[PDB]
Ligand binder design. Sequence first.
Ligand SMILES: *Cc1c(COP(=O)(O)O)cnc(C)c1O
Length: 461
Amino acid sequence: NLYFQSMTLESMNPQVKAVEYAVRGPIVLKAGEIELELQRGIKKPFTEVIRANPITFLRQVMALCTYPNLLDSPSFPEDAKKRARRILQACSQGVNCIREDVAAYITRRDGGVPADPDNIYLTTGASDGISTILKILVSGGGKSRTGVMIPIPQYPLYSAVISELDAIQVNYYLDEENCWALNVNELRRAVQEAKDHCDPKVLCIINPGNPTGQVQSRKCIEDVIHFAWEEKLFLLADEVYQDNVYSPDCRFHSFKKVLYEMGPEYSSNVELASFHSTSKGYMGECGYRGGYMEVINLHPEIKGQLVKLLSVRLCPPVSGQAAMDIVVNPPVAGEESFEQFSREKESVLGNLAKKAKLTEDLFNQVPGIHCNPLQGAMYAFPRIFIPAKAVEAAQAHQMAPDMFYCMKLLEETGICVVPGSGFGQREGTYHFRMTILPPVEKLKTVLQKVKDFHINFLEKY
Ligand SMILES: *Cc1c(COP(=O)(O)O)cnc(C)c1O
């Protein structure tokens, strides 16, 4: 299923190799076949295959760090320069003053709930943090082997890491009939069923969600923390999309803030690792890959393994670290760039909110498609109601129903989306992942195509 695509020798001292593996399923192969058809002049109903997958201050600080001579330029505000200088001067858990900046950023975001720089670890993406935390937590054998609880629909990193570590995957189903909510009665069933054949010890929460685009309510975060406390579960709070919250009905509440607000009975006891990245959201930068995790209440046995693991790895590249520093040091009240930064953010978030409402509106006025509200992150996961007969057609082709549907959509419109079966879903349900990344007029055009295709599809099978 997985095939070797590339290798990179990252270093010899210490020696690290990075291997890329590609899954080359039916859609990937067909998209390639179609791209070559278009290249040798085959006339198609579309002219291209479409996949789909800004803040001045950040560009400015980045430009200053790339070319420090611009610290004497007047093309640049002084609050930018102040960031560049601190980063240039600073360049084991990560650079000290960057960890301080993250801590201070957490504190501001959480309305004054304190964060300690010594609980911060800089990583090469949230992926690296999640891998590292899961690796130090998995142990035991047979019926005592660590169970890791993960949502369905999945962000497929977690399944993959669980396999590499030979841990046991414990599925919990996000609640599609209540905006993809985490449902504790459901988590309780999943934990109770898994205890026969593993030791459930870890619970991974993705908020805002991917590919489901939901934002959890405070009460629900609170009920999950209580459940984790009760069952002695280590929580991983994957919060990489925390700045991309759109709905006026929703806000981002960190697991950190809620844990602390529940009081010391919880906040002294519950183990929590919260992740953040430089790659996601409207503050997202590319090229320079950074991240952090904030870890609280780490059991000493676990911390020992972390200290060792970090003694034998190289620090994350400092440019990733610098990138993270920029994202956790935006301008604050009374600084030169605060007002324009504030206007740029609001405009970007208003445009996403607009695309979100637009997408969900269109799907919900098309029969046989239903879309939960898109509250944050960049993806929707619409449910497709595939007739028992289009299901039969799909079966005849040896394909999952939504794979077949997504293949046909590609073949007719050139629109290339990922089927729900790439993420997992409740048995008997079918979805696909949609992005709101495209600009509004293009997004409108994609949604028209998806609508026409969808109506015809139902007519046909
Ligand atoms: C992309 C992503 C990650 C990994 O983040 P990087 O910083 O790119 O490693 C983790 N969790 C979710 C939900 C993601 O979308």
